[PDB]
């Protein structure tokens, strides 16, 4: 197993933490809790070339919670710059994030990600998004919410870092699950917990799944 430091940068509220969390646990966090400085999480993908680990440095986009700022970028091997296709300012700031990043990390693969393409009223039109071209960034439209192009940033970085253009994500192996006996002592415990769960509504009952 080989590990790579990945820094995630972009304006507050663009979907950085939401995107990473979805990748870590599968959950979609609807609430906006501004990152304080940085959150560091390991993230592993299984490939045809074996497992690849990203040390994800999910940095704060809001100036007041910026912490060490470019101090987070030191020894980064790859990066995602994020903006929100529903907020023009977030795309206007993409060159600022890129500037700060490449002054510290001169020769790294970087993906530009326009997040929130699930939202009908898009404000940053496809035709406007050209900044990646002269800077040799990969670009993806993504949605942390719909999972549109969800895996694409990591697959592209994996190909770049391993140096194999035919690297694929593969199905992680699935061990036989164990048989357990129901604990007689925890019988009453589970009645309670199941009671509460049944009477709490599942979110987004209007979605396709």
């Amino acid at each position: 197993e080989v590990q790579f430091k990945l820094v995630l940068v972009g304006d507050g509220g663009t979907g950085k933490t939401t995107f990473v969390k979805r990748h870590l646990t599968g959950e979609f966090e609807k609430k906006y809790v501004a990152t304080l400085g940085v959150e560091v999480h390991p993230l592993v993908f299984h490939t045809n070339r074996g497992p690849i680990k990203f040390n994800v440095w999910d940095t704060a986009g809001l100036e007041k919670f910026g912490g060490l700022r470019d101090g987070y970028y030191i020894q980064a091997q790859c990066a995602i710059i994020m903006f929100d296709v529903t907020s023009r300012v977030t795309y206007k700031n993409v060159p600022n994030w890129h500037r700060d990043l490449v002054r510290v990390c001169e020769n790294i693969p970087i993906v530009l990600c326009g997040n929130k393409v699930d939202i009908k009223d898009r404000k940053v039109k496809a035709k406007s998004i050209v900044f990646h071209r002269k800077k040799n960034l990969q670009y993806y439209d993504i949605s942390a919410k719909s999972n549109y192009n969800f895996e694409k940033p990591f697959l592209w970085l994996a190909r770049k870092l391993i140096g194999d253009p035919n690297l694929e994500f593969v199905a992680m192996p699935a061990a036989a699950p164990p048989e357990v006996v129901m604990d007689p002592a925890l019988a009453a415990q589970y009645e309670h917990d199941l009671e509460v769960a049944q009477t709490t509504a599942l979110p987004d009952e209007d979605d396709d799944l």
């Binding site: 101090g71 600022n96 002054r103 510290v104 071209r133 140096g163």
Partner: protein, 996 residues
């Protein structure tokens, strides 16, 4: 443990401890990493931390520590520098310069500590922005001098000059005052002669590739602003386009330089310059062909292989060729000796266009769009590019995406349309032969038949009708044969979908061939019985698409038919739609609505509408009867679903018929509003019996769906209505009685935001005609909605949006309703407007600012009367200060433009003496005093308290500029942005506000 020690400033700093904390952060894991993180952040943000930098830079052995030290120094330099005595500023400056030279004179450090050197260089540049040139006239002479002493120093000096050029020309706009940006730009301009001499000498004298690369990196930045003569009147063009293209170390940066060279502002009427522009292109392409790859090379393969920096190189080549050719290809077009160069450059672009890389493809496609548009219009030019265009036809056709990808499909379509016009025979031949390769299996796949079908569809309307006729027949024959050929429902459904697609894109053909059109529709009806996935959706989608284009053919009696075909569709509608899902049924009824709206005889239109709505109306009649006979029956899950689907069918038909829908709305209107009440009762009852959780249950969500579809139906009709007198006389009063009290008297969680949306449409369309109705709307929804949304910025997001949309339209159409509010309620209205200003959500913020603008306008209109004078006395300063808050707090940048517009309006009111009464209360200022003098005083005081680090002089100069510029929005905005820069630092120059 010990780690928190560094935060204790009452003791001296333990550098070994700092280095451990830093190591734990950068190299540690989990809990340890997180704790170190928090500690470092608090260290760095300590306002005296900068005092420790000297100590850290001298005595630390951890380069990451030194990096963070320089971060701390940068905060001081950019925010508080001008507080320092001159001696201290010179001290810091000298220390930084000394550290840079020292790290450069050590080869080992220079090689291995690039991070720290680059950070140091940036720190130096932050000092230059503060100190240079006024306080450091010798900086550039000394840098130039120091460059000859050592290759490392010279190389690092190129990094400094690059960063300087970026900070002054590329990133100054948002970070400096207009005056300071101009000062630094003029300063660099004045000393550039000397800087260029150094760069040119390095490029000529050569040797060290790392030095040469750094020098070309700085040149790239210079090219954003330097005059053309430094490029065209020196040898540098030749060096870039020959020497530096041959070696791979310099080739990437050189290509980017030549791209920017191609963008210089250059004289247009000068033959020598034209020849020079030709020559550097010729040289560059010759070096490519000889040192990198020939014109014939398979760039698709090379890119895919992704060796070394090949991908970046090929991207950069595409950018260079497209940039140069889009500006200069006319230079290559008339001289027969430049024909081969012109066509080789375009051949490279054809090869680049074959690379499987979406974003690169789009770059080349933008160029191809420019070229073929030109060949469509420019005389005697298409013949030059015949073989290029032929290859490009194949590239576009093989790369056609689904129309769902709207920008890319649009771009591709437009290029293919232009190319089809330029040679229709070539396009046809390519499409027919691609079709043959589908039929013979050699290129058969779902992706490939799909992409071909999309390409064939995209050029509809480009051929003559006769040519199109033969082409369409050939294509449909071939696809039909393909369909027969294929085995298994999967295969047949793919081709059948593609047939449907192509036919739907050729309405001109359908319109000429009634026999064929009828067959197509009848086949679509057959397909609406196929459960194989995707088939029913494509059948329905194709039906409505054909109807949108060919509707007139369904409403006339075609010769040899007994009746208009719409009658035939309606007669059989039960059977046709029997196997469709509800949403598919709705599309079907919508399509029928499109047809019926073509019938302009009223009696016939109304009869068709009656016949179309037969099955929904009969289901409705039975339910309304049974349902009101027995209110119980509505509890049934299945009935609720039937009702919702009846309402949805009404919405679908009203969507396509608008004003023509009225007789149908009239048939259901009164019982529909009774159902709204009955459903509302059940929801109220269920929430009482079961709690707020009830609103999550399938039964209550079913009931609410009925309410929302009813509101959607009424909103749809009213938004398109032509007879507003009937809207007011017949629709509005029952609507308000049915929905307003129900909204008010439900708990927050049971209130439908759709009510607000419906009311917005009502006020929009007929607000002027129902002044008492608007008052009733405000009384019903205003205070109870405000109370839902005024505790935070997140709760009830739909209500939030719809609420300010409603207030906006009321403020536009029936301002009188706000005059009728009691003082306390009017105060809540002002509170609500300012609350919207403070939102990050852009829908709300923008409506908030617009309401404020419109409100000021509405008060102005009233002229000199008590209400207007009382408004100003009570609220003028609330609006001025609330607007300043959101302008200056850095959390509301998306609203800058409208905040500025609002502030400009407010200031201009006082500057023009357009406010009749004193804004100050008695015994606060000499009693004669003008509102202009008092506004000045109040703002000076307000800004002084909010920004105590500003001088009186800064504030007075700012306000003086602001008031003089309150009739010139772009200049006013400049002054605001200047102020936003100055508040982030100490000691901003007050003369900056005189910028002109």
């Amino acid at each position: 443990g010990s780690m928190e020690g560094i935060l204790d400033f009452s003791n001296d700093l333990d550098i070994a401890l700092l280095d451990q904390v830093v190591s734990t952060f950068y190299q540690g894991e989990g809990v340890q990493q997180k704790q170190a993180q928090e500690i470092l952040t608090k260290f760095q943000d300590n306002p005296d931390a900068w005092e420790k930098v000297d100590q850290i830079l001298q005595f630390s052995t951890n380069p990451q520590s030194k990096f963070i030290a320089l971060s701390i120094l940068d905060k001081l330099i950019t925010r508080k520098w001008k507080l320092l005595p001159n001696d201290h500023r010179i001290g810091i400056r000298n220390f930084v310069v000394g550290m840079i030279i020292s790290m450069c004179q050590d080869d080992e450090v220079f090689k291995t500590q690039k991070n720290l050197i680059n950070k140091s260089d940036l720190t130096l540049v932050q000092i230059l922005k503060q100190e240079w040139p006024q306080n450091w006239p010798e900086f550039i002479p000394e840098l130039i001098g120091s460059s000859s002493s050592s290759v490392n120093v010279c190389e690092n000096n190129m990094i400094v000059l690059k960063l300087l050029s970026e900070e002054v020309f590329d990133f100054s706009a948002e970070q400096m005052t207009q005056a300071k940006a101009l000062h630094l730009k003029n300063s660099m301009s004045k000393e550039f002669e000397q800087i260029f001499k150094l760069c040119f000498q390095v490029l000529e004298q050569g040797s060290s590739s790392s030095l040469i690369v750094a020098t070309l990196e700085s040149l790239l930045r210079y090219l954003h602003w330097i005059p053309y003569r430094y490029i065209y009147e020196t040898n540098i063009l030749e060096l870039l386009s020959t020497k530096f293209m041959t070696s791979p170390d310099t080739r990437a940066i050189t290509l980017k330089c030549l791209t920017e060279v191609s963008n210089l502002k250059i004289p247009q009427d000068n033959d020598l310059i034209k020849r020079q522009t030709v020559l550097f292109f010729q040289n560059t392409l010759q070096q490519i062909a000889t040192s990198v790859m020939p014109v014939t090379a398979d760039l698709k393969a090379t890119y895919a292989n992704a060796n070394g920096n090949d991908q970046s190189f090929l991207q950069d080549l595409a950018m260079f060729l497209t940039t140069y050719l889009a500006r200069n290809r006319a230079l290559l077009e008339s001289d027969e000796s430049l024909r081969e160069l012109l066509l080789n450059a375009h051949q490279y672009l054809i090869q680049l266009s074959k690379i499987e890389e979406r974003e690169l493809f789009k770059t080349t496609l933008d160029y191809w769009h420019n070229l073929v548009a030109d060949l469509f219009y420019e005389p005697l030019k298409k013949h030059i590019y015949e073989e290029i265009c032929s290859q490009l036809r194949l590239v576009i056709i093989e790369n056609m995406v689904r129309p769902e990808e709207i920008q890319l499909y649009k771009s591709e379509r437009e290029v293919l349309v232009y190319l089809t016009h330029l040679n229709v025979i070539d396009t046809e031949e390519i499409m027919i032969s691609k079709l043959a390769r589908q039929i013979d299996g050699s290129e058969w796949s779902w992706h490939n038949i799909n992409t071909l079908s999309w390409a064939i569809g995209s050029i509809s309307g480009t051929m003559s009708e006769d040519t199109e006729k033969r082409f369409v027949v050939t294509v449909i024959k071939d696809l039909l044969g393909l369909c027969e050929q294929k085995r298994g429902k999967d295969n047949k459904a793919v081709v059948a979908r593609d047939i449907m697609y192509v036919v739907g894109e050729y309405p001109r053909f359908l319109k000429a061939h009634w026999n064929f059109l009828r067959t197509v529709i009848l086949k679509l009806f057959e397909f609406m019985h196929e459960t194989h996935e995707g088939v029913q959706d494509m059948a329905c989608d194709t039906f409505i698409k054909i109807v949108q284009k060919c509707k007139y053919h369904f409403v006339i009696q075609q010769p040899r038919e007994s009746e208009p075909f719409i009658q035939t569709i309606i007669r059989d509608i039960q059977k046709t739609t029997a196997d469709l899902q509800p949403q598919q049924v709705h599309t079907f009824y919508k399509a029928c609505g499109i047809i019926i709206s073509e019938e302009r005889s009223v009696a016939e239109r109304n009869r068709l509408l009656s016949d179309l709505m037969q099955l929904p109306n009969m289901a409705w009649d039975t339910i309304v009867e049974q349902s009101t006979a027995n209110p119980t029956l509505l509890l049934d899950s299945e009935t609720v679903k039937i009702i919702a689907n009846i309402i949805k069918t009404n919405v679908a038909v009203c969507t396509s018929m608008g004003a023509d829908f009225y007789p149908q709305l009239g048939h259901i209107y009164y019982n529909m509003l009774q159902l709204y009440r009955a459903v509302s009762s059940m929801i109220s009852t269920q929430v009482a019996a079961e709690g707020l959780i009830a609103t999550k249950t399938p039964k209550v969500r079913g009931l609410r769906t009925i309410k929302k579809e009813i509101l959607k139906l009424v909103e749809t009709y009213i938004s398109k209505a032509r007879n507003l007198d009937d809207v007011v006389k017949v629709l509005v009063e029952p609507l308000l009685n049915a929905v307003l009290e129900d909204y008010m008297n439900n708990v927050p969680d049971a209130r439908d935001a759709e009510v607000l949306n419906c009311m917005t449409t009502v006020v929009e369309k007929v607000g002027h005609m129902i002044p008492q109705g608007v008052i009733l709307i405000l009384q019903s929804v205003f205070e109870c909605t405000l109370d839902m949304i005024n505790k935070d910025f997140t709760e009830y997001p739909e209500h939030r949006v719809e609420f300010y949309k409603l207030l906006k339209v009321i403020n536009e159409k029936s301002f009188a309703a706000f005059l009728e509010l009691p003082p306390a309620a009017f105060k809540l209205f002002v509170d609500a407007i300012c609350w919207a200003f403070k939102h990050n959500n852009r829908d709300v913020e923008v409506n908030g600012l617009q309401i404020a603008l419109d409100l000021v306008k509405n008060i102005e209109r009233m002229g000199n009367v008590p209400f207007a004078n009382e408004f100003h006395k009570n609220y003028f300063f609330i609006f001025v200060s609330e607007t300043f808050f959101v302008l200056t707090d850095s959390d509301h940048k998306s609203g800058f433009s409208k905040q500025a517009l609002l502030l400009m309006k407010l200031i201009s009111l006082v500057y023009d003496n357009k406010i009749s009464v004193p804004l100050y209360q008695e015994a606060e200022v000499p009693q004669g005093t003008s509102n202009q003098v008092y506004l000045s005083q109040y703002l000076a005081n307000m800004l002084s308290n909010a920004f105590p680090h500003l001088t009186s002089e800064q504030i007075a100069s700012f306000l003086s500029a602001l008031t003089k510029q309150c009739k010139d929005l772009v200049v006013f905005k400049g002054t605001l942005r200047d102020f936003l820069v100055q508040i982030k630092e100490v000691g901003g120059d007050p003369t900056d506000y005189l910028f002109a």
